[PDB]
């Protein structure tokens, strides 16, 4: 599919409201596994289960192990701009 850019806002006390799976050590992208009701991603729209997250706030996720991607995504605050593509 086409690559999309989607920005949401996250307050410091909030999570992103997504679950991810995949990663370099499993030979697949960082994939959105679930979008959780009522949390920032759900309230924004534009992210979808099965999207690959290619980058977040300009930080490349294409060659990251699962744990590293968790670290990177968890460290984003405020404006969070996702670069995603449906694989």
């Amino acid at each position: 599919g086409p690559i999309r850019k989607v920005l949401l806002l996250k307050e410091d006390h909030e999570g992103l409201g997504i679950s991810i799976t995949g990663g370099k050590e499993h030979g697949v992208p960082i994939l959105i596994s679930e979008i959780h009701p009522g949390q920032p991603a759900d309230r924004c729209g534009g992210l979808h289960v099965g999207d690959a997250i290619l980058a977040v706030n300009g930080v490349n996720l294409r060659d990251t192990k699962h744990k590293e991607a968790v670290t990177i995504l968890s460290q984003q605050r405020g404006e969070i701009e996702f670069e995603v593509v449906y694989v």
Partner: peptide, 8 residues
Amino acid sequence: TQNICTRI
């Protein structure tokens, strides 16, 4: 066991 889903 190794693939997991992580909530963030």
